[PDB]
Amino acid sequence: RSRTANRSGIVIRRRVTPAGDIIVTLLTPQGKLKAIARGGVKGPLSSSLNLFHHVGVQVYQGPHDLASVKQAVLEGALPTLAEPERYAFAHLMAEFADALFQEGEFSEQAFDLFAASLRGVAHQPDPEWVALVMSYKLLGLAGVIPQTARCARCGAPDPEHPDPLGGQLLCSKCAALPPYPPAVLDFLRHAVRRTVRASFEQPVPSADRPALWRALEKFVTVQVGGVHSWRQLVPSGVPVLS
Amino acid sequence: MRSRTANRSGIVIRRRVTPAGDIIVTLLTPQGKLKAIARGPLSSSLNLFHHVGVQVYQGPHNDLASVKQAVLEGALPTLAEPERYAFAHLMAEFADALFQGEFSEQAFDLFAASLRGVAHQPDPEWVALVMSYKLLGLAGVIPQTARCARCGAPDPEHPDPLGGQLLCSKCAALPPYPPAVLDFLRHAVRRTVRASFEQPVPSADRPALWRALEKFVTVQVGGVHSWRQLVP
Ligand SMILES: [Zn+2]
Ligand SMILES: [Zn+2]
C-alpha cells in the first residue's frame, strides 16, 4: 500500500499559521480529516482551501503526525454562502457537526447530510430552519441517545415539558415549567426520524425557535463532552448599526 | 451603581442560564464590572463574549441589576473555533478574578482588544500571554521585574518559584531564564501590545511564562481560580 491518499470533502475550519501554512479541517465521507498545506498562503492552494468549499486533496501521512496536503482541487462551491446570514448558518453547521461527532463517529451518511445542510443554507429561503432541521437530524447519526418517549426523570409516557437539567423532556408532574406548545412538541418528537424534506415543509414559527435552539444546546452539552464553542453561533440577536 | 435606571455597554464575560430560564451575566464595561439578570423576549440573549448594550434597573430591593433591554452591538464569530474560544474564556476568567471598582475605560479597551486578537490572529496563545501581562499593568498588581524579589538587587535573571517574579543569581536556586523569556518578563507590561505581537517567544519557552504568570497571580490576587484550570 502507500502513505499518500486521495480524499474529498468540505473545509470546515481554516487556520493561517504564523509561518504562512494553512491548517484545515475537513469533513469527508471517510471521517474527519486534519491536514496542513505548507507555505500554503503564498502558493496555488490558498483560495481552494476556504470554508465551505468541497475539495479533492492528495494527502501524505509521514511515518512519524499531521497529514500534509500535496495537491488540492476545487470540486464544488456555494458562492451564495458569502451572504452574511447564510454564512452564519453554514458556520454554525460546521462547528456544530465537528463538536457533535467524536473521532471515528463521522460516517458517510453524516457527510451526505452535512453537505445537504450547506446546500440548504445556501439555497433555501429560511436558512435558520434548514439549520434547525439538519442539526436535529444529525443527532440520529451520532453517539448521543435522543429519548422523547418517556419523562427523563420518572419514565412516564409522552412527556410534554422542558427538561432544563438534561435537555430531554419531563412530564407534567416532574416539570416546573409550562408545556412546550404543540408545534414545538411535534418537532422535538419526530425531527430525528422524519425526512428533512418533510420537515422543511413544516417550519416552526420564529417565535418558537429559541426553545428549539435551547433544547438542542442543553442536550448536546449534557450528552457529548467538550467546550461546545459552536454555541457562539446559535441565533442570539441582530447587530445594531454601522 | 449610583442611580436606579442606567444604560450600559460592554462584553459578556460570564453567562449561566438558571433552571427557571433566567440569564445571569457578568459584563465588563468602560465604567467597571456589572453583574445582572435577565428574567426569562429581549433583543439579545446576551451570549458569551458578545458586545452588548443594556438598560438595567437596580433599586434598593434587588440583589442584581435587572436587564430590561438588551441589543447586540457586535460579535466575533471566530470565537466559535474551539481553540480561540478557550483563550477567550481564559481572558474572561482572568479579568474577572484580576479586577476586584478597579476596571477602567483603558482596561475595557485592552480587554476588548484581547478578544479581537484571540479571534483574528494566527497565534492566540501569544495574544493571551501578552494581554494577560498588559492587564496586570492596568490593575493594582504589577510584577516588580526591575529588582530581586528577595533582596532587591537590580536586574535579576533567575526564576522565582515562590512568587513568580525574578530572583538574582545569589538568591536563586535555578539557572537563569533564556534571553527571550527574560526580555518578555522585563518588558511585557510596558511594551505596546503591537510591539510584543511582533516579537513572539518560541513555544518551547512559553510554559515557563505561563508558570510565572500563574504563580504571581495566585500570590497577589484574591479569589481562588477557575482561571488556573484553563491555563495551558
Ligand atoms: Zn415524570
Ligand atoms: Zn537577591
UniProtKB/TrEMBL annotation, chain A:
It comes from the Bacteria. Residues 4-74 form the DNA replication/recombination mediator RecO N-terminal domain. Keywords: DNA damage, DNA recombination, DNA repair, Metal-binding, Zinc. GO terms for molecular function: metal ion binding. GO terms for biological process: DNA recombination; double-strand break repair. Zn(2+) binds at residues 151, 154, 171, 174. Belongs to the RecO family. Involved in DNA repair and RecF pathway recombination. This is DNA repair protein RecO.
TrEMBL record, chain B:
Keywords: DNA damage, DNA recombination, DNA repair, Metal-binding, Zinc. GO terms for molecular function: metal ion binding. It comes from the Bacteria. Pfam families: RecO_C, RecO_N. InterPro entries: ARFGAP/RecO, DNA_rep/recomb_RecO_N, NA-bd_OB-fold, RecO, RecO_C. Coiled coil: none annotated. GO terms for biological process: DNA recombination; double-strand break repair. Residues 5-72 form the DNA replication/recombination mediator RecO N-terminal domain. Zn(2+) binds at residues 148, 151, 168, 171. The keyword DNA repair applies. GO terms for cellular component: bacterial nucleoid. The keyword Endoplasmic reticulum does not apply. PANTHER family: DNA REPAIR PROTEIN RECO (PTHR33991:SF1). HAMAP family: RecO. Belongs to the RecO family. Involved in DNA repair and RecF pathway recombination. This is DNA repair protein RecO. It comes from Deinococcus radiodurans (strain ATCC 13939 / DSM 20539 / JCM 16871 / CCUG 27074 / LMG 4051 / NBRC 15346 / NCIMB 9279 / VKM B-1422 / R1). The lineage of its organism: Bacteria, Thermotogati, Deinococcota, Deinococci, Deinococcales.
